[model samples]
Target: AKVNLYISNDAYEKINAIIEKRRQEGAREKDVSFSATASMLLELGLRVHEAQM
Candidate 1:
């Protein structure tokens, strides 16, 4: 048998909160872009562009 462990909703939420806070503080657009990208990456394995890039 094999088991896989993943980050929990609480953890994801924490990351989301941090990202939002950074955005609120006027973090670089590029930085916020990566956070959005990373959120998708976490949920989707990889972004479509990331696979091509």
Candidate 2:
């Protein structure tokens, strides 16, 4: 059996807020930027796909 998780609108907003906060804080780091964060997210997404297999 499998379960599906739904993200309510409020939860979506909260997650976006957290991502934005991380982006802003990461910007202060010497090597971290929004683009890097995006890339990392993409890589993590791919990893999650692999995990499902």
Candidate 3:
């Protein structure tokens, strides 16, 4: 299953910039997608608990 993501204008630009930079350095789809998601998550400060490692 998959879900759509929505973000603000500033975050939109930032995520795209990160993806473009990684692509320029030869990042693949998975790499860029994870990077963008993680960056936006951190920026938005989603408060969630992590499972015990």
Per-residue accuracy of model 2 over 5-31 as CA lDDT, tens digit each? 565788557655656686686545434
Q: In model 2, what lDDT does residue 46 have?
A: 90
Q: Score every model by TM-score.
A: 0.44, 0.46, 0.44
For model 3, name the residue pairs that clash.
none
lDDT string, candidate 3, 1-53, tens digits: 34566768887787778787888887777677855565656656644434332
Best prediction by TM-score: 2
> Which pairs clash in model 2?
none
Q: How many clashes in each candidate?
A: 0, 0, 0
Per-residue accuracy of model 1 over 1-53 as CA lDDT, tens digit each = 34355777887677777677878896865586635645655667556657778
